Design a protein around this ligand. Structure first.
Ligand SMILES: NC(=O)c1ccc[n+]([C@@H]2O[C@H](COP(=O)([O-])OP(=O)(O)OC[C@H]3O[C@@H](n4cnc5c(N)ncnc54)[C@H](OP(=O)(O)O)[C@@H]3O)[C@@H](O)[C@H]2O)c1
Ligand code: SF4
Ligand code: SF4
Ligand code: SF4
Ligand code: SF4
Ligand code: SF4
Ligand code: FES
Ligand SMILES: [Zn+2]
Lengths: 206, 69, 106, 147, 111, 176, 234, 89
């Protein structure tokens, strides 16, 4: 292969050492599942303790991460437990990227990452906005990307793309901008999904 | 339009992609315009708010329904 | 001479030696059977030997840091806070928490 | 009789001479609106002055995307404007939501908030095409107050 | 227990009571500071109809989340936030509004 | 790589201190800053007045949509719904019916200008090269209705730009 | 029942079960052209070729049964070299109709090129075209788009009753038509358009009206004709 | 051809006793020039030498994928999928 392959695996075995090192501590409180693919590491964490996992990787003699920078969340209705809050972490001294995930349904409150990371509070507001996941012991939980008179949570797959309150008229009332009107133009639902399985090995037995 | 004091870019025939900005060769000197008898012979101005302008139109014949004695 | 960061570059030796000796005792208070104590100790002992051998050399600061002594002192300053938090909240020593539901593949 | 018809054009010539637009930085369109200042394509002191100000300006350009958060915000700006006011919806987002549209947050059409007189269709609305929007505005002013 | 939320069963009910007092005191204040809009008495009637739809109470987990949301959408007035009589308005102004009957809805023909 | 932004004390003793003090006592560098705009005033400005002069362009530029046709009559658009699915704005709609007898080419063909973020994707996805993006700037309306394009018609009225399109596509086959 | 492992995983199957039928139990679909649901088992394409653990020649999935406990791999090195090759042979004499063609996404051959066949290039020069076959009301048949297989040939003989479709030539000239100029009978032969994988036989009443892309599907039982259930309407 | 006032283009109906069409009154409605496909039949049919002929618009420059057309029946000349051009013998 010359153009077909992106990069050959060489650091994959080196990154697999981290998949053993953190797992050598072996907590049922923390570890659970460790996944490593395409020069990247992924860890999912039990809901009971998220803060003790975040205090780890911060400082530490073996690996120095410090920056718990970017913070995402996954909406998926397949599992019994719905949401999956995903932390993307980066090291400056070590130069590596590790991932921290949560497995809980988190309609019930989850522990905040504000005491460990300063910029985490702004991302925590977005998760409460789009997904509707409350963070316990959080300072200033305020709406950012949502409207001031917005109902529900705008991202959830349970409701349509257009929404319920979206169209804003002016018409009859001199100053009051309208809200209750719900109709919008037709978004064409594409049913484009290819027959036959796309890739081998990814197939799971029923 | 019959205007000399005020005129927009509605004027000028097929030459905008020629000596006006893009191409190097002049439209009546070196590079000739291709004939196909499909293109309009007389150049038209902008639609604007004036009469004889752009309009939307229906396309489908729809579902037919008829009742007769 | 001063470091680029806000932390002031102060000429202090053995300051790194005090903090690295302090954290070893904290680890030997509550966890003993846990692997957290067993793995972190051998890295710290390896680093302490480099300080004792090299007297105020930039090569000693270049080992596993390479951003002067000011950056290495910050690594020791938060090490005591990380060890105390690990001692307070039991996670390394005890493992008994419930397992997740069987789903992972997207 | 003849003086009445000619004096009306003189008042219309005053707006044909100069038009002061509002500098709304609410878009990628706003960067192309900054290309009106860029010397290569200029209406600057040809008619356009970048001083703007919420009250003194005659024209307001609604640049691109508007959310439901900015829907009450842009409406109160329109009320502060003087009676001879013209609104240009420069960009496909301003015309009816170029992208997004079917989205929850983006307001469709802009005319649901503020009425539009001149529409500019372009996403990256090229400064060449942006020059039409002001020139068409000057051409559209023909007759005001007969009686 | 799991999961905590904030309160356990009976304690969650009294959190709604504390929330009710804070919002009842703001509706006379949001006439002079905000705008006249409709009425002070009619604004207080808008409060009672809002809590009637929320009135179910089966688990404290559902109740606790309503308190946090209740300290947000009804908080959009206390600390002075911009709305300009467009946001935080719950009642429909342009509603038709439709009725539920086999003679009223069927005459208009819907669904 | 390191470059360093800090000067690290430009003044040391006597001679180096006085000139650093002279620029703060009076001005000097402000008068030197005045000279920057002074020469900038004299040099000729690059300005284009639109109703007479025109700005620079390219052989491939996307503006207002227009569908092309064959040299011997016949609509080039074959009706696929290919360009419909690629369209990221979903501005283009297509419903097709058989044309009289034999031929099967279009019936409904609306492209929204309220939508459309201008990609050239519909130009690329088209195997027959029907929608070719012509050098267009002039489009200004009073309503949305006048702005959004109807069932071909106004798109077919792009014959006034199809002479330029035929010239531009000659710089497009075997790309640049 | 004898058990034989396919792709290392063991699956129990019947003594007279087919190779592709055994593959369904392991949750793997081989590339098909000649059916396995209701139409009779026949070769005449050699697409579903699979390589055994110790065999010099690959065997077809439609014909060859498992019988003895032998290992067969679906994602083997020999199978992928086979699947890319056969696709090129199918498309060496194919009229190129894809944008005009009545199917587009619904076409089984269209997906198999994307999933299995060679992408970068296809070596071909000069393709033969067949004359249009006569058809009555339903299915505007085009003989050029046809890949010349045995699916609709056996459908008229077994499923429909009245036989019409067969062979006409020998080489790359053999048509799937009736040879004699006669319109196809009704009865239940209207379902023949849905059976064919290629865009050769497709309903004339709803031809070129809507593509497979952008169509919302819903299942509902038919009102016309009794004992009719499950029919997808776009 | 035109019905009452509005002209039909590419098979289109105007209005049934003037009810739907109302917007096209002050502004003139658009119409495509020669949309009846009269230019399709105006082009002369080319003679073929081989049994199967390949069609092209104008090489790789003009958008035309290559389709082979069969000529076997004497009655009704064969035409390609993209063009209205017919071939005989
Ligand atoms: N509160 C009240 O005053 C009251 C009480 C009881 C009943 N009403 C009823 O309610 C209605 C109120 O309407 P209004 O007074 O608000 O209307 P208005 O302000 O006078 O507006 C009418 C408009 O129509 C145009 N127009 C009318 N007749 C015209 C003509 N012959 N030629 C040219 N233009 C003409 C005028 O345009 P130009 O200005 O350009 O000519 C004017 O802008 C009245 O018809 C009245 O019967 C009112
Ligand atoms: S129309 Fe295009 S350039 Fe303008 S705001 Fe929208 S996305 Fe940005
Ligand atoms: S524009 Fe091109 S891709 Fe779109 S329907 Fe017409 S021929 Fe097909
Ligand atoms: S340019 Fe892009 S958005 Fe516009 S019609 Fe083509 S594909 Fe759609
Ligand atoms: S039969 Fe399938 S692959 Fe062949 S042209 Fe038709 S849609 Fe394309
Ligand atoms: S028409 Fe279809 S089913 Fe019949 S032989 Fe040809 S490809 Fe096979
Ligand atoms: S698919 Fe098995 S022989 Fe054709
Ligand atoms: Zn052709």
């Amino acid at each position: 292969r010359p153009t077909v392959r992106p990069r050959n695996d060489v650091a994959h075995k080196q990154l697999s050492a981290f998949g053993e090192y953190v797992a050598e501590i072996l907590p049922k409180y923390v570890q659970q599942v460790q996944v490593s693919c395409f020069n990247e590491l992924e860890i999912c964490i039990h809901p009971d303790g998220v803060i003790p996992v975040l205090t780890f990787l911060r400082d530490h003699s073996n690996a120095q991460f410090k920056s718990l920078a970017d913070l995402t969340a996954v909406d998926i209705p397949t599992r019994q437990n719905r949401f999956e809050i995903v932390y993307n972490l980066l090291s400056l001294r070590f130069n590596s990227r590790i991932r921290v995930k949560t497995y809980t349904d988190e309609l019930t409150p989850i522990e905040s990452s504000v005491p460990v990371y300063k910029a985490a509070n702004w991302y925590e507001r977005e998760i409460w906005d789009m997904f509707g996941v409350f963070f316990a012991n959080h300072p200033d939980l305020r709406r950012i990307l949502t409207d001031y008179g917005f109902e529900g949570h705008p991202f959830r797959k349970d409701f349509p793309l257009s929404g319920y309150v979206e169209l804003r008229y002016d018409d009859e009332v001199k100053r009051v901008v309208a809200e209750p009107v719900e109709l919008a133009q037709e978004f064409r639902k594409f049913d484009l999904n290819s027959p036959w399985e796309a890739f081998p090995a990814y197939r799971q037995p029923p | 339009k019959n205007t000399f004091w005020d005129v927009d870019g509605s004027m000028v025939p097929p030459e905008w992609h020629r000596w006006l900005h893009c191409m190097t060769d002049d439209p009546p000197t070196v590079k000739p315009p291709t004939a196909r008898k499909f293109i309009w012979t007389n150049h038209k101005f902008n639609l604007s708010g004036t009469p004889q302008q752009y309009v939307p139109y229906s396309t489908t014949r729809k579902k037919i329904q008829e009742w007769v004695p | 001479t001063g470091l680029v960061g806000l932390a002031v570059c102060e000429t202090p030796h053995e300051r790194l030696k005090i903090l690295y000796t302090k954290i070893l005792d904290v680890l030997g208070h509550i966890p003993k059977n846990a692997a957290y104590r067993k793995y972190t100790e051998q890295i710290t002992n390896e680093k302490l030997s480099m300080v004792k051998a090299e007297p105020d050399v930039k090569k000693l600061e270049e080992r596993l840091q390479g951003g002067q002594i000011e950056e290495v002192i910050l690594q020791a300053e938060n090490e005591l806070s990380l060890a105390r938090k690990m001692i307070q909240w039991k996670p390394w020593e005890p493992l008994v928490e419930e397992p997740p539901a069987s789903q992972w593949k997207w | 009789e003849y003086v009445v018809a000619k004096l009306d054009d003189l008042i219309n010539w005053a707006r044909r001479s100069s038009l002061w637009p509002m500098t709304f930085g609410l878009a990628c369109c706003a960067v192309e609106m900054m290309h009106m200042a860029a010397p290569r394509y200029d209406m600057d002191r040809f008619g356009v002055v970048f001083r703007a100000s919420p009250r003194q300006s005659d024209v307001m350009i609604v640049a691109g995307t508007l959310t439901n958060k900015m829907a009450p915000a842009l409406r109160k700006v329109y009320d502060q404007m003087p009676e001879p006011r013209y609104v240009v919806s420069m960009g496909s987002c301003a015309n009816g939501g170029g992208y997004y549209h079917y989205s929850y947050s983006v307001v469709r059409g802009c005319d649901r908030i503020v009425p539009v007189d001149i529409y500019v269709p372009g996403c990256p609305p090229t400064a060449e095409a942006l020059l039409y929007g002001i020139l068409q505005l000057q051409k559209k002013i023909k007759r005001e107050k007969r009686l | 227990v799991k999961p905590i939320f904030s309160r356990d069963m009976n304690e969650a009910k009294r959190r709604v009571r504390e929330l009710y007092r804070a919002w009842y005191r703001e509706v006379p204040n949001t006439v002079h500071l905000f705008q006249l809009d409709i009425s002070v008495k009619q604004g207080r009637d808008k409060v009672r109809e809002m809590f009637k739809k929320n009135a179910h109470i089966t688990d404290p987990r559902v109740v606790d989340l309503l308190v946090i949301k209740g300290k947000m959408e009804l908080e959009e007035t206390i600390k002075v936030w911009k709305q300009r009589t467009h946001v935080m308005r719950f009642f429909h102004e342009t509603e038709a509004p439709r009725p539920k009957d086999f003679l009223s809805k069927f005459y208009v023909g819907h669904d | 790589t390191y470059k360093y932004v800090n000067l690290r004390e430009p003044s040391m003793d006597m001679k180096s201190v006085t000139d650093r003090a002279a620029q703060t006592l009076l001005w000097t560098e402000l008068i030197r800053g005045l000279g920057m705009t002074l020469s900038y005033l004299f040099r000729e400005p690059a300005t284009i007045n639109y109703p007479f002069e025109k700005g620079p362009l390219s052989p491939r530029f996307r503006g207002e949509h227009a569908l092309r046709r064959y040299p011997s009559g016949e609509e080039r658009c074959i009706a696929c719904k290919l360009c419909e699915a690629v369209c990221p704005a979903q501005a283009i709609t297509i419903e097709a019916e058989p044309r009289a007898d034999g031929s099967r080419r279009t019936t409904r063909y609306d492209i929204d200008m309220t939508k459309c973020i201008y990609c050239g994707f519909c130009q690329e996805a088209c195997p027959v090269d029907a929608i070719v993006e012509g050098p267009n700037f002039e489009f200004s309306t009073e309503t949305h209705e006048e702005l959004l394009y109807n069932k071909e018609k106004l798109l077919n009225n792009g014959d006034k730009w199809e002479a330029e399109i035929a010239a531009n596509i000659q710089a497009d086959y075997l790309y640049r | 029942l004898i058990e034989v492992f396919v792709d290392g995983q063991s699956v129990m199957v019947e003594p007279g079960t087919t190779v592709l039928q055994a593959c369904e139990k392991v949750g793997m679909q081989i590339p098909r052209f000649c059916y396995h649901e209701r139409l009779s088992v026949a070769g005449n394409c050699r697409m579903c070729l699979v390589e055994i653990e110790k065999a010099p020649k690959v065997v077809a999935a439609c014909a060859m049964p498992v019988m003895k406990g032998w290992n067969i791999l679906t994602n083997s090195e020999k199978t992928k070299k086979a699947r890319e090759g056969v696709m090129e042979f199918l498309l060496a004499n194919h009229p190129l109709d894809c944008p005009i063609c009545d199917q587009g996404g619904e076409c089984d051959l269209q997906d198999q090129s994307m999933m299995f066949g060679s992408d970068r290039s296809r070596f071909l020069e000069g393709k033969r075209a067949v004359e249009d076959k006569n058809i009555g009301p339903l299915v505007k048949t085009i003989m050029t788009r046809c890949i010349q297989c045995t699916r609709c040939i056996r459908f008229a003989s077994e499923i429909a009753g009245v036989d019409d479709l067969g062979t006409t030539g020998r080489g790359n000239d053999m048509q799937v038509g009736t040879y004699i100029e006669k319109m196809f009978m009704s009865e239940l032969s209207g379902n023949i358009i849905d059976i064919c994988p290629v865009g050769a036989l497709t309903x004339x009443x709803x031809x070129x009206x809507x593509x497979x892309x952008x169509x919302x599907x819903x299942x509902x039982x038919x009102x016309x004709x009794x004992x009719x259930x499950x029919x997808x309407x776009x | 051809x035109x019905x009452x006032x509005x002209x039909x283009x590419x098979x289109x109906x105007x209005x049934x006793x003037x009810x739907x069409x109302x917007x096209x009154x002050x502004x003139x409605x658009x119409x495509x020039x020669x949309x009846x496909x009269x230019x399709x039949x105006x082009x002369x049919x080319x003679x073929x030498x081989x049994x199967x002929x390949x069609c092209d618009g104008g090489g790789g420059a003009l958008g035309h994928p290559r389709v082979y057309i069969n000529l076997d029946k004497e009655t009704k000349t064969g035409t390609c999928g993209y063009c209205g051009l017919q071939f005989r013998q």
